[PDB]
């Protein structure tokens, strides 16, 4: 069912996360962590204190799809065991130093063709698939986008609700 999902998305904030490669999204799904550039890191740390749930919606560049979405469970932290991100051209490990812990809510894909009816008021009402890494998605758009994903019956949201 979708009822626990809707409870988790209640009054959530949503952010578009863009990844240059599939490898880091697979690593994020395996290890429950994410790292972003400092400008987005600051925005996510602020949002984490501000909302019952901060939702990251992932899209690998040029994939034509979203790869899933996750809830922040921590602010960023430094000093953990090195996350072996695959660094794109021009990107260094220091730029990706802050590490957020995340809990996956859906690890299934959604193709962009399925979200073409959703526009983001915070990005000039462009289709929600359009946006830079870190673009905030307004509540109603974000909620409907997350509800479009296929159910991920391997995840039990009971623990996530208790983190709230
Ligand atoms: C582990 N965290 C991350 N891993 C990867 Cl592979 N890419 C990330 C990222 N955080 C932001 N980006 C990003 C988004 C859009 C364009 C580019 C680019 O360099 O062209 C890079």
Swiss-Prot record:
Tyrosine phosphorylated. The modification Phosphoserine is found at residues 81, 92. Changing residue 123 to D: Does not affect ability to influence alternative splice site selection. RNA binds at residues 18-20, 34-35, 85, 133. Residues 12-149 form the YTH domain. Changing residue 85 to A: Abolishes binding to N6-methyladenosine (m6A)-containing RNAs. Abolishes binding to m6A-containing mRNAs. Changing residue 132 to D: Does not affect ability to influence alternative splice site selection. Coiled coil: none annotated. It is found in: Nucleus; Nucleus speckle. Changing residue 24 to D: Abolished binding to N6-methyladenosine (m6A)-containing RNAs. Changing residue 68 to I: Abolishes RNA-binding and ability to influence alternative splice site selection. Interacts with SRSF1. Interacts with SRSF2. Interacts with SRSF3. Interacts with SRSF7. Interacts with SRSF10. Interacts with CPSF6. Interacts with KHDRBS1/SAM68. Interacts with TRA2B. Interacts with KHDRBS3. Interacts with EMD. Interacts with RBMX. Interacts with ZCCHC8. Regulator of alternative splicing that specifically recognizes and binds N6-methyladenosine (m6A)-containing RNAs. M6A is a modification present at internal sites of mRNAs and some non-coding RNAs and plays a role in the efficiency of mRNA splicing, processing and stability. Acts as a key regulator of exon-inclusion or exon-skipping during alternative splicing via interaction with mRNA splicing factors SRSF3 and SRSF10. The YTH domain mediates RNA-binding. This is YTH domain-containing protein 1. The lineage of its organism: Eukaryota, Metazoa, Chordata, Craniata, Vertebrata. The chain holds residues 345 to 507 of 727 of the full protein.
């Amino acid at each position: 069912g979708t009822s626990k999902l809707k409870y988790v998305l209640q009054d959530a904030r949503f952010f578009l996360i863009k990844s240059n490669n599939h490898e880091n999204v697979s690593l994020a799904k395996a290890k429950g962590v994410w790292s972003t550039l400092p400008v987005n890191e600051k925005k996510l740390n602020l949002a984490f204190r501000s909302a019952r749930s901060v939702i990251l919606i992932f899209s690998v560049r040029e994939s034509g799809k979203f790869q899933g979405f996750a809830r922040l469970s921590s602010e960023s932290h430094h000093g953990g065991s090195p996350i072996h991100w695959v660094l794109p051209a021009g990107m260094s490990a220091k730029m990706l130093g802050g590490v957020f812990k995340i809990d996956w809510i859906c690890r299934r894909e959604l193709p962009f063709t399925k979200s073409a009816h959703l526009t983001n008021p915070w990005n000039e009402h462009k289709p929600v698939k359009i946006g830079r890494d870190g673009q905030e998605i307004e509540l109603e758009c974000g909620t409907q986008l997350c509800l479009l994903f296929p159910p991920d019956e391997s995840i039990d949201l009971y623990q996530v609700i208790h983190k709230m």
